[PDB]
Every structure is written in C-alpha cells, then in structure tokens.
Design a protein around this ligand. Structure first.
Ligand SMILES: [Ca+2]
Lengths: 615, 43, 45
C-alpha cells in the first residue's frame, strides 16, 4: 500500500468516486485491509457506494465450501434468516461488519467496527456471533481463528467501556448498557451473557452496576447487619438505618429489592429444611399424614410451582433447555422428583418403609442446594467454582484407590480363607473393611492370628484360628499370616500416606492454577444470579402461592454520539502510543538518516561539478 | 521469515542506522575538506 | 461389501481393540477372584 499511496495518491492525480468503486470492490473481495482503509479515507462516499447487488456480490465471494457458504446454501443475500437461526430469533458500516464477521476477515471487521455507530453493542455482538459460529465450524482450525477474533472483539469492548465509565459513570453504566439496540433487540449484558464474555463482566464498571441492581433502590453501601435488622423489624426501614404514596413506595422498594428477595428466600428455605427434619425424624408414621406432614406437602408443592415458573418464563423449547442448563435448576428438579416418589410411596399401603427411605435421601439433596448461598459472597463464590474444578483430581484418586482396594482386599481375603464364604460377607471383607482401614479403623484382632486363639473348626488340612469379630468369619487359615500382616503394612503406607498426600498435592496445584479463571467465572455468573432474583415474586415460597395466583429519540442519538466520541479518543490514544513507541521511533529515525545520506550524496555530486566548473 | 524478523529487530535496526550515520560523517568530512579547497581556490 | 467393510472398520479400530481388551481383562480379574476365593480347593481343579 505504501507504493500506491506514495505514487498514485501523492495528490498529483485527480481521482473520483467512480474511479475507485471498482478498486474498492477488488480490495474487499481479495481481503486487502489497508487498501480499503486507504480508499475510503480518500473522500469516498460509502453510503452511495453500497448497493444490494454489490452486497449480494460480496456474499457470493465466500471461499469455496466454507461454513458461511453452507448457511447461504441452506438459506439476494437473505442474511436476515442466517442471523436469526444463529442467534436464536427469540448504516453501511453495520452491514459490512456483519459480512466481514461471517467471512472471518479479522482486519475488515477490525476496521468496520471502528467506523460503526453502536461500538460497545457491536463488539459484544461480534463476540457472540464469532463464538457460536466457531462452535459450528468443522474446519477445526478456522474455529481457532474465529475464537481469536472473538477474544479481540471482547477486548476493545472492555477497553472502550472502561474509558466510557471513567468519564461519566451515570451515562455509561445506566444508559449505554441497559438499552435495546438493533443488533438483537437485547441489552449489552444479555449479549455478553450469551457470548460468555467473562472479561466483560470482570471490569469494575459492570460489577458496580450489577451491585446497584442487586441492592435495588437501597444504597449499595448498606451494611449486611442493617439489612438483617430491617428484615426482622419491618418498621426499622422507615428510619435512618437504611439509605435509599411515600410510605408505600419505600415499603415496596425495600421488599422488592433483589437482595431482600434473596434473604427472604434463604430464611424460608432454612425453615423448610427445619420443618422437613422435624417431620422426617418425629412426625413420620405409618398412620395417615398429620397436620405438619400436610403442611410440608403444601410447602413442597409451591416450591414445585416456583421452579415451574422459572423454567416456563426464564420459544418454549428454547427457554426450557436454557432453564435446564443450570446445575442448580437440575438440583432442584431431582429434589422435587424424589419428593414426589417419597410421598407416592408413603401413601401406598405397602410401601411405607420405601417411602421413608427415599425421603431421607431426598433430604440430602435439599440440604446440598444450600451451597447456592455462598455464591453471593465475594470471598466464597470463587471458592465454590474452584471446588467444581477439583472433580478431575477426585476421580483420579478414586480410580487409583479402587484398584488398590481390590488388589489388597481380595488377596487378604484369599490368604485368610474365612469359612463364612457368603457373597454379602465376602464383599464386606474385600471392599468395606479395607476402606475403613484408611480412616484409622484397623481390626488387628480379625487378621493377625497371634491376636486370636487357635481352634479346630473345619476338617480341611492345616491350622485355623477363631477371630473374635462377628463379620470376620467363623475361622480363618493361618498358613502364611505374616504375609497378611505385611500386606496390611504396605496397604497403610500406600493408602493412608502416599495416595492421600498425593491428592493434597494435586489439590494444591489445581487450586493455584485455576484461581484466576474461577474468579472471572464467578463474576460472569454473578449477573445470572441477579437476573434470576430480579423477576422472582416478592414473597416467600410458603406464601408464594398467592403471588402465583395473582400472577395467573434525541437522547438515544446524543448517547451514541457520546460513545462514538470516546471511541475515536481511545483509538487516537492507542495510535499515538504506537507511534511514540521506541520501535516506531527507531523506524522513523532510520528513515530520516537514509534521507540525509541521499541528500548528502547529492551534495557530494554537486560538490565535484561545482569545483570542476570553477577551475 | 525468520531472517526477515531478525533483520527487522531493533538491535539489527540499531546496527544498520549506526552504519549509515558513520557513512554520513565520512561524507560530511569530505564535504568539509571540499569546502576549504573551494573557498581557498575562489579567493 | 459395504456391510462387511463397515463391520471390520469398527472392530479393527485401535480404540475398539483397547476397549475390547479392557472389558476382557476385567472379566479375567473377576474370574480370577471367583476361582481364588471360592473355587480353589485341594481337590483336582
Ligand atoms: Ca431455581
């Protein structure tokens, strides 16, 4: 391009818009980024240039049997349909940006986004489109390039918004994010959530906005103890303790805040568990259910209704699979399913014990759900995410332990030759007994012959000893008992020491490695938690039934200009820093010295002629 | 590509730009020596 | 033939050979344990 700009665009040649339209098409079709930037920069009217026929020609230039080419074949560009079934379907710069992203041209989309209008929205939208198409690309190498470009687009979206937030917190946080653009008629946060743009949620501006939405109409600096006191003392909200008709508006603001909904839900869930335990341990009888058991049945029924409302209103198949995609929602679904089985079996005349048994296991699932609380805390949310990533280490330890238990367990059983020889008992002595030896339960009197008396039990040849244990067998062989003791010594060394300490080292390495990513993941998923509690009914699950029964311009242009101004300021600063770098400075100073050498040589040539002429 | 990157490195660029300036100094000295003779001859 | 080629391709794949060997090895261990714990007697095998 330097040769073309220096020679053709030195200004001597008078150009025209039509003289460059053909060249502009060629640069676009042949992936020439610096040229299209140069051609447009030379006073070319893009708006009058682009035509639907030209746009159709641009999309016809998809490279051979490309992924994008397949979508047009399945789908007159008709790109609207291609956009709809990609996203989900639940200004020439924008069109050019879409074309570049579909064709996976980095610098084209790079340049087009810089000239776009809704830069923050487009950057997140570009990241979403690239990631979903990268997952859909079978090339397995172009997808890597798509993910790279998606990371780049997420990059400036963070950088541009960070600059916008620093200038005007009110303008950037409130209006720029919570707005519906033409991209998908969805807020920038929704685009980031769908794109899983974790780095976008990591910045302080997004986090500060989320906290304000989380706290509703109350000050984000309100202490936790102040909230709890107001929760248990409703009149306390009408004092100076909480900082925000007048009385009704304040009342609804406090009880409509997502944090108070979370706190109210948490207290209700704890009471439900307490009621569940009381019924299970005491009030559960073969007789027809009592008053408390009926209350528990009603309480669980509303919990089922609330979970149904979340899934139904969270495109019926599209939202249903979205609701089921959350692990916690899966935990809720299985807990309610077991509860239904327990109630059905309990009411059955001949299945009372089975009904109680499954309910006890069902209580375990409900109690485990309580871990969702720690996701709210800033210092505990990352910890839970790391715990989820430790499962790979746990599985390795379990598989290693399982092999060792089988090897040691069967050999010890084979050497002892207990005369019980019963399949339930054999399994106990092979798996159960060695397992407890890991945790300090070593029944030496059940394997060491020296600790048990000698007796005659069977007519089989050899010597036998009578263990005192109930499940240790009637009598065991004592042919080579030193080996059984030796195997116990080796088993304790491998299991109690080597394997356990190995897992600790594996946990320590994993915790340090995934610490950063988990923090990003928790920050990204923090928006999902806030959105879920934002639309939840204001009442507690026991009382949520009544809520369910009740349930059944110039400013925009000014904001966009303000965003666009900050974009050009950010770009100019980045370019200025690039030009002011040492490497660029070394590049420039080399050019000037070369120019000095050429001019010096001209002086030398001038010197000889002048001296010769003078003589 | 490896050789081009080596030549485009800052250290190599510093090496080259030092050579050209040294050439400029030698040519400048030639001009200075030419300057004295021409001025003397003119007088 | 097409059916035979597909059949041999599946059962000739190294991963399926590994999976088939793994299942066989587990069965061998299970048979080994059953003989050792129960069927092992001083009588002829
Ligand atoms: Ca839920």
């Amino acid at each position: 391009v330097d040769i073309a700009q220096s020679e053709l665009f030195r200004g001597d040649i008078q150009w025209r818009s039509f003289h460059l339209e053909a060249s502009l098409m060629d640069a676009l079709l042949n992936d020439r980024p610096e040229f299209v930037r140069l051609l447009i920069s030379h006073g070319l009217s893009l708006g009058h240039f682009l035509t639907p026929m030209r746009l159709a020609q641009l999309y016809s230039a998809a490279p051979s049997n490309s992924l994008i080419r397949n979508l047009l074949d399945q789908a007159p560009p008709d790109v609207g349909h291609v956009l709809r079934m990609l996203l989900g379907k639940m200004a020439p710069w924008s069109d050019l940006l879409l074309w570049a992203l579909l064709l996976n041209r980095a610098q084209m989309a790079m340049y087009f986004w810089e000239m776009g209008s809704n830069a923050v929205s487009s950057a997140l939208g570009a990241c979403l489109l690239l990631r979903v198409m990268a997952r859909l690309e079978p090339d397995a190498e172009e997808a890597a390039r798509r993910k790279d470009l998606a990371f780049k687009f997420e990059g400036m979206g963070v950088d541009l918004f960070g600059e916008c937030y620093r200038s005007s917190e009110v303008r950037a946080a409130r209006l720029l994010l919570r707005r519906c653009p033409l991209w998908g008629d969805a807020t920038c946060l929704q685009l980031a959530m769908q794109a899983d743009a974790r780095a976008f949620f990591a910045q302080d501006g997004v986090q500060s906005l989320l906290t304000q939405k989380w706290w509703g109409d109350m000050a984000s600096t309100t202490p936790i103890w102040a909230l709890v006191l107001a929760f248990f003392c409703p009149p306390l909200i009408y004092t100076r303790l909480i900082t925000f008709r007048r009385c009704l508006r304040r009342w609804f603001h406090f009880w409509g805040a997502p944090v108070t909904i979370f706190m109210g839900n948490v207290v209700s869930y704890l009471l439900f568990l307490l009621l569940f335990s009381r019924v299970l341990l005491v009030d559960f009888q073969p007789a027809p259910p009592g008053s408390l058991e009926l209350l528990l049945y009603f309480w669980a029924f509303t919990l089922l209704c609330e979970e149904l409302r979340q899934g139904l209103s969270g495109s019926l198949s599209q939202r249903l699979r979205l609701y089921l995609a959350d692990s916690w929602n899966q935990c809720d679904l299985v807990a309610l399913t077991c509860f239904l089985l327990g109630v059905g079996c309990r009411l059955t005349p001949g299945l009372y014990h089975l009904g109680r048994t499954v309910l006890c296991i069902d209580f375990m699932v409900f109690t485990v759900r309580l871990l969702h609380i720690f996701t709210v805390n800033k210092q505990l949310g990352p910890k839970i995410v790391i715990v989820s990533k430790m499962m790979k280490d746990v599985f390795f330890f379990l598989f290693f332990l399982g092999v060792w238990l089988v090897a040691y367990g069967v050999a010890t059983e084979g050497l002892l030759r207990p005369r019980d020889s019963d399949f339930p008992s054999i399994l106990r002595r092979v798996f159960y007994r060695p397992y407890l030896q890991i945790f300090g339960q070593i029944p030496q009197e059940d394997m060491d012959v020296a600790l048990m008396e000698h007796s005659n039990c069977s007519s089989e040849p050899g010597f036998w000893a009578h263990p005192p244990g109930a499940q240790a067998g009637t009598c065991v062989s004592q042919y080579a008992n030193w080996l059984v003791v030796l195997l116990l010594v080796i088993f304790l060394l491998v299991a109690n020491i080597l394997l356990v300490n190995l897992l600790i080292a594996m946990f320590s390495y994993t915790f340090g490695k995934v610490q950063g990513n988990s923090d990003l993941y928790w920050k990204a998923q923090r928006y999902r938690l806030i959105r879920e509690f934002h639309s939840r009914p204001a009442l507690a699950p026991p009382f949520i039934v009544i809520s369910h029964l009740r349930l059944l311009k110039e400013a925009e242009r000014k904001l966009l200009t303000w965003e666009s101004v900050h974009k050009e300021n950010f770009l100019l600063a980045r370019a200025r820093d690039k030009r002011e770098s040492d490497s660029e400075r070394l590049k420039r100073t080399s050019q000037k010295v070369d120019l000095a050498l050429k001019q010096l040589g001209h002086i030398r040539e001038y010197e000889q002629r002048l001296k010769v002429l003078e003589r």
